[PDB]
Amino acid sequence: MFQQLSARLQEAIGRLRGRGRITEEDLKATLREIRRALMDADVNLEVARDFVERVREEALGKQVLESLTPAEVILATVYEALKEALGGEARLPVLKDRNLWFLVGLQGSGKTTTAAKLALYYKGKGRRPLLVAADTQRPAAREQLRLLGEKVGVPVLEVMDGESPESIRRRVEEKARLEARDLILVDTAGRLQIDEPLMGELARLKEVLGPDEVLLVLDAMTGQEALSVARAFDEKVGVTGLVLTKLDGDARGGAALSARHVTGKPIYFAGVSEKPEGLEPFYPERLAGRILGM
Ligand SMILES: Nc1nc2c(ncn2[C@@H]2O[C@H](COP(=O)(O)OP(=O)(O)O)[C@@H](O)[C@H]2O)c(=O)[nH]1
Ligand SMILES: [Mg+2]
Ligand SMILES: [Mg+2]
Prior knowledge:
Elements (H helix, E strand, L loop, with lengths): L2 H12 L9 H17 L4 H17 L8 H17 L12 E6 L6 H13 L5 E5 L5 H14 L3 E3 L6 H15 L3 E5 L8 H14 L3 E7 L10 H7 L4 E5 L8 H10 L3 E5 L7 E3 L2 H8 L3
Helix pairs in contact: 1-2, 2-3, 3-4, 4-11, 5-6, 7-8
The protein binds guanosine-5'-diphosphate and magnesium ion (2 copies).
The site of one magnesium ion (MG) has 5 residues, from helix 5 and helix 6.
GO molecular function: 7S RNA binding; ATP hydrolysis activity; GTP binding; GTPase activity
Family: Belongs to the GTP-binding SRP family. SRP54 subfamily.
Subcellular location: Cytoplasm
């Protein structure tokens, strides 16, 4: 994953391999290349500075200038730096008997596809999901989820035009109660940009529906710019976790590496394809190892 970054990080580190002990000027050259690699991957400035800082300082603390295999030392410290940036320990929502989740984000971020992906994911984990197309102004948006629900074999409750959050709540609670659905996935409305009035409806919907999780869906391809809306959603609504989509089309990885710093929210899942099966729980340690070709 993150082809360009993986290639560059590995190339930079390899310069310290197969040539005996290295000089600090040798180390500095590799450190500068790593820094350039991060900047080119669209990684947050502070994250990049911190990254290289600890790689250097940790390597030096591990007597890298005296090691007979210095590239292995740097690889290890680069792995720890990567792991930190990605989130440390993997995290996933803790499900209970009743689970109502909100999928929020701008249009095109991958909300509808992710809703279905999550339905299919938990469907095979002992859960009975219910998809809810909550756009009370755009019928076309609701239809999109309707078709997807069919493909994944998961029921889709469509809200009616202008339906009040109270009517939506009672209708969802009824369907879920009568059909034994323990995982409700609400696909909320979204525009190409943050809409104040729309954000007001969203907050009101949260108040009435009382979601257990509020997943902010982010298109990794938009770079670190994708994280700009995070603050707005958390203040007005309250984001509990993130979903990074289109990671299969992201060669940089800037959004994934910067999410932690900028948003302070954990990444629960990663979208790795346009297909309903293209969903994977976010694993910081696994991803760090992959990027470094481990
Ligand atoms: N390659 C790839 N495409 C994705 C992924 N998630 C969503 N998409 C595509 O992104 C576009 C927008 O997704 P959609 O669910 O409609 O977003 P919404 O407007 O936020 O509901 C669609 O063409 C999807 O097929 C992903 O993980 N990988
Ligand atoms: Mg460890
Ligand atoms: Mg949608």
